[PDB]
Design a protein around this ligand. Structure first.
Ligand code: MG
Lengths: 106, 61, 153, 397
RNA sequence: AACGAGAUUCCCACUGUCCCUACCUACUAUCCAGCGAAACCACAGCCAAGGGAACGGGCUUGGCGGAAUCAGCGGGGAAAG
RNA sequence: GUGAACAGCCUCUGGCAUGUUGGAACAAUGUAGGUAAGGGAAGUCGGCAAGCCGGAUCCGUAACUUCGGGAUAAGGAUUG
RNA sequence: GUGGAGCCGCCGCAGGUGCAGAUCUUGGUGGUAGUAGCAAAUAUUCAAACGAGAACUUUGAAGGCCGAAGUGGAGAAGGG
């Protein structure tokens, strides 16, 4: 029932590999979802528009190899699903991924 | 909440294409009320429907 | 109307019927032979895991070409499948049977599914277009399904 | 009718049911003959193939055109941590074949043996042998436990040994012991059986079972290739380009009047993952791995009498798809059945041979531990950074 | 002579046409959710030898014969049109 | 825009949602697209199929002929 | 047992007088079979709104294609 928020590195280049040239960016978001439902553990995952653009910034067949995300477990309202937690997976841009590790943010 | 008619009438009265129309998607139920062209020219003036200007094709190089 | 095999004690039994509804006959027949004799709160929970593909439906009779899945080992079988349109039409009717039970003044904590049968409806047709100027039918095969629920005590 | 041009059979009918074999660990189909006069000894051993390198050795073979020169040979190395003997099985013979007489296991068995007896170790309560250990210590269960060795000694004629592998010593993610059952072919059965009660739950190294330049056999399960077509499963000739419906197929799969597809014809199915037994694989070296911490563990593998370096047989960068060898190992000339990280049972040969190619001594002069993860050209990291010099690696100090 | 999507033989260059095959890619095939035909069909379907309308799935004498099936396959059903 | 070009390829105005469905997997066999060491038609009824050659500039162009041709013959060099 | 308004025996009479086949006629239904298949022209993705319900609707953003002999903008014939 937490409301905590963490920020992660995902290398997409490892998690899509041998994926075709026209399925290469569309898989790259259903591997971000399978991360966030593994990590924050909830089936309800929302990502926002500024992270869709960051993966699709180089076409389908050229995925950026690695991205820096932050994940926000929150709760819902107004006759929600029988799960009441959801994650808003949103994007923090960075210039260099070297020595970057997953910190808990406040 | 079909907005096909308001999409069609706007490009007729803005003298543009259907492609270049309408940023600000928030006022949906307000502009879904307009079903005339006389109504649709009010939404232009109140700034809810814009022109969305022309894509760049620079002859610089 | 009148069903197949009136129950032995109609005071403490409930019933539903659905006629002429468009599913496939063969897949609905075999998701009903899975839940025969099964308690309602187990059947309502098992039918969710068919649509969520967590627990399958063994195809025992009409099994021509039906591929194999590992979830069919619980049923002692090899072949299995997860009909979700069929698992919703006789789950939307399994609510109707427990909707009729509380109008009859019956306890739903002990309702088991004694009798359930699926049999065919008249086939409604449309036509497809094959080589050399030929017509051949896409005949649809809907079904009449029909169920008795009984308290055990 | 009379093909006009004679060709031989494609494939051998001796290996016919090209089946996924029912075992991952290789079964010893037939153990070497045992005689009472010869000392008492084990006959097989479990190992895990790690990869291949090659070698440089001084050949010694009089008469050939190679004599007294250097030859490179392709060698595979198989990491074999020492086995632990756990149980003792006797076999009495019938006129219906051998039959298991009865088995006696060790007093306290290891934890990774017990992991072999479960398909779900996590959902378990680990209750195996909890009631069988108590009979070694309760005295009523103990004076009949010594009774079952005396009836073992009296009746059954061939006895074997249940041992397992120490999977704690390997870089694999497996941790289940591979539980084998191997035959002691020594003297008479009383000395053959007192030789196993003495060494229950005690380790048996590899150099005590095998020897240097002592030719053995490799038993394994082949490289599984999947469901592959006719011209790859049987190496049948492809059809010419013009062929309608298909190129890589066998054309005539039989005559008219036998009226049935014969067993002797080539067609598509599972290629690889089959049980095969190699014959006559020579051992080059029994190395021992990564000793004491008193001064240093000492890497010191692959350092022959001409090399004299602080090398170790694990190549520069670690073995591709295997890991980094810390144990006792066996190196074998030639290709060996299986992928890397695959169990394969080494075994003494049934047949006797002299043949002047077996029974010869070998002296290694070089083992390259160059990087296999590409075209390696250096061998030890000090030999690289002596040649390479300093880099941008420090850049502060 | 010129000109042939005309018939033919040889030579240079070129090459997986071949020696001798191998690997990669896309769409399938495969598995699933939904939707769903037609051809054909006496009954049906394991063999050998025999006799026979002279070449049997059935008959005779032998060999033998376990539920349900999935991917292929082209021997046969003297397969179908 | 490139270019000799209403060729091909890439964008703008203006359109569209991949052509009667999606999801997962990447086996055989295919259909289409490629590469190949050494040899170079030994394959085959047959060089079928595929591959070479290919633009332009400056050179240089045979037999034969109805004196028009052949002819971008052939063969060469250069290109940012 | 269903069913709900007509029907039968005997003596004579009269036929459009009795089916298993006709690659029979008309109608119905199976096995095959939940199988073949829903694969020509590169491609979709994120949020939101309406909704009982959204891979497919509308909208916003991103990514793409037709690329001026078009997947653009107007007509004749035809359709009504
Ligand atoms: Mg044997």
């Amino acid at each position: 029932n937490e409301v905590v928020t963490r920020e992660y590195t995902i290398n997409i280049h490892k998690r899509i590999h041998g994926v075709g040239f026209k399925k290469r960016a569309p898989r790259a978001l259903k591997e971000i979802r399978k991360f966030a439902m593994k990590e924050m553990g909830t089936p309800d995952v929302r990502i926002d528009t500024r992270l869709n653009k960051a993966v699709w910034a180089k076409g389908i067949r050229n995925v950026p190899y690695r991205i820096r995300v932050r994940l926000s477990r929150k709760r819902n309202e107004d006759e929600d699903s029988p799960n009441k937690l959801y994650t808003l997976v949103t994007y923090v841009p960075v210039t260099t991924f070297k020595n970057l590790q997953t910190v808990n943010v406040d | 909440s079909m907005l096909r008619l308001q999409k069609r009438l706007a490009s007729s009265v803005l003298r543009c294409g259907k492609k270049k129309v309408w940023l600000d998607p928030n006022e949906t139920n307000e502009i879904a009320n307009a079903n005339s062209r006389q109504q649709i020219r009010k939404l232009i003036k109140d700034g809810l429907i814009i022109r969305k200007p022309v894509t760049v094709h620079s002859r610089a190089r | 109307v009148r069903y197949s095999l009136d129950p032995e004690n109609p005071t403490k039994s409930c019933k539903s019927r659905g006629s002429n509804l468009r599913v496939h006959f063969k897949n609905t027949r075999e998701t009903a032979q899975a839940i025969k004799g099964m308690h309602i709160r187990k059947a309502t929970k098992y039918l969710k895991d068919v649509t969520l593909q967590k627990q399958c439906v063994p195809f025992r009779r009409y099994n021509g070409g039906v591929g194999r899945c590992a979830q069919a080992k619980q049923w002692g079988w090899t072949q299995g499948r997860w009909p979700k349109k069929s698992a919703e039409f006789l789950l939307h009717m399994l609510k109707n049977a427990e909707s009729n039970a509380e109008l009859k003044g019956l306890d739903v904590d002990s309702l088991v599914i004694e009798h359930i049968q699926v049999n065919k409806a008249p086939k409604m047709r449309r036509r497809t277009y094959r080589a050399h100027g030929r017509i051949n039918p896409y005949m649809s095969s809907p079904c009449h399904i029909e169920m008795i629920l009984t308290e055990k005590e | 009718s009379h093909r006009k041009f004679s060709a031989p059979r494609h494939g051998s009918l001796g290996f016919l049911p090209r089946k996924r074999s029912s075992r991952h660990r290789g079964k010893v189909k037939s153990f070497p003959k045992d005689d009472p006069s010869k000392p008492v000894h084990l006959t097989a051993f479990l190992g895990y193939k790690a990869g291949m390198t090659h070698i440089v050795r001084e050949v010694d073979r009089p008469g050939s055109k190679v004599n007294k020169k250097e030859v490179v040979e392709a060698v595979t190395i198989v990491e074999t941590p020492p086995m632990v003997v756990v149980g003792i099985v006797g076999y009495v013979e019938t006129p219906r074949g051998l039959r298991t007489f009865k088995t006696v296991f060790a007093e306290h068995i290891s934890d990774e043996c017990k992991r072999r007896f479960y398909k779900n170790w996590h959902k378990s309560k680990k209750k195996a042998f909890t009631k069988y250990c108590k009979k070694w210590q309760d005295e009523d269960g103990k004076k009949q436990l010594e009774k079952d060795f005396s009836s073992m000694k009296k009746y059954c004629q061939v006895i074997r040994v249940i041992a397992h592998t120490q999977m704690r010593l390997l870089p694999l993610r497996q941790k289940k012991a591979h539980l084998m059952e191997i035959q002691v072919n020594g003297g008479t059965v009383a000395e053959k059986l007192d030789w196993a009660r003495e060494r229950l739950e005690q380790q048996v190294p590899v150099n005590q079972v095998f020897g240097q330049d002592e030719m053995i056999d490799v038993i394994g399960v082949t490289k599984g290739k999947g469901y592959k077509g006719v011209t790859s499963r049987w190496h049948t000739k492809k059809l010419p380009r013009k062929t309608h419906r298909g190129l890589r197929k066998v054309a005539c799969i039989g005559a008219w009047h036998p009226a049935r597809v014969a067993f002797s014809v080539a067609r598509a199915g599972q290629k690889g993952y089959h049980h095969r037994t190699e014959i006559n694989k020579k051992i080059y070296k029994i190395g021992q791995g990564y000793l004491i911490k008193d001064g240093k563990l000492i890497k010191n593998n692959a350092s022959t009498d001409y090399d004299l370096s602080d090398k170790s047989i694990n190549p520069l960068g670690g073995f591709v798809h295997y890991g980094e060898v810390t144990n006792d190992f066996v190196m074998l000339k030639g290709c060996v059945v299986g992928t890397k990280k695959r169990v394969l049972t080494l075994r003494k040969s049934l047949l006797v041979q002299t043949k002047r190619r077996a029974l010869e001594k070998i002296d290694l002069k070089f083992i390259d531990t160059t990087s296999k993860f590409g075209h390696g050209r250096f061998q030890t990291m000090e030999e690289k950074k002596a040649f390479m010099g300093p880099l941008k690696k420090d850049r502060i100090a």
